[PDB]
Each structure stands twice: as structure tokens, then as C-alpha cells.
């Protein structure tokens, strides 16, 4: 029972690993979304004109 209880705790730790992975992936999603939406900023537009 004690050994099998540790097995449950191991997959709980694996869920925590997945949570940290998702945190980094979400940050990349927001950073690239903001870059895509902003597109050409005011400085770049000024240089072109």
C-alpha cells in the first residue's frame, strides 16, 4: 500500500510538470499574438513614409 501510494504521488508530480510546461507555452502564445496584432509599429511606419 505504501509503495502504491507513492506511485499515485508520482503521477501527481507529473501533473505539476505538465502545468509548468503549459505556463511557458501560454506565454509564447500571448507574446506572438501581440506581435502579430501590432504588426508594423509607429517607428517602422514613420521610416517607410
Amino acid at each position: 500500500i505504501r509503495i502504491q501510494q507513492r506511485t499515485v504521488d508520482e503521477v501527481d508530480a507529473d501533473i505539476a510538470v505538465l502545468a509548468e510546461s503549459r505556463r511557458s507555452a501560454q506565454n509564447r502564445l500571448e507574446k506572438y499574438q501581440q506581435l502579430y496584432d501590432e504588426d508594423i509599429n509607429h517607428g517602422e511606419q514613420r521610416a517607410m513614409s
Binding site: 509503495i3 507513492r6 504521488d9 508520482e10 508530480a13
Partner: protein
């Protein structure tokens, strides 16, 4: 956590080794042990002869 479970498995194997030690010792402290059987058929074989 996986290391803890593996360590407990080592303790599990050590416990099983001690269990067979107790089984063998109980077999020797038995009333109907090897010594009792050996002398009874030895005595009866001489009587039968």
C-alpha cells in the same frame, strides 16, 4: 519520488528473504521434523527386518 518507491522495493525484497528464513527455521523446530522421521523409520525398519 520514483527513487523512494524503488528504495521501498528493496526493503520489500529484503522482507521476503527474512520470511523464507522463518519458514525454514519453523520447519526445523517442528515436532514432526526431519530428525523425528529419520529415527522412526530407522527403528521400524530394524523391527521389520
Amino acid at each position: 519520488i520514483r527513487r523512494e518507491a524503488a528504495q521501498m522495493q528493496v526493503e520489500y525484497q529484503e522482507t521476503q528473504q527474512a520470511h523464507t528464513q522463518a519458514q525454514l527455521e519453523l520447519l526445523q523446530r517442528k515436532f514432526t521434523n526431519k530428525a523425528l522421521y529419520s529415527w522412526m523409520r530407522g527403528k521400524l525398519s530394524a523391527i521389520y527386518y
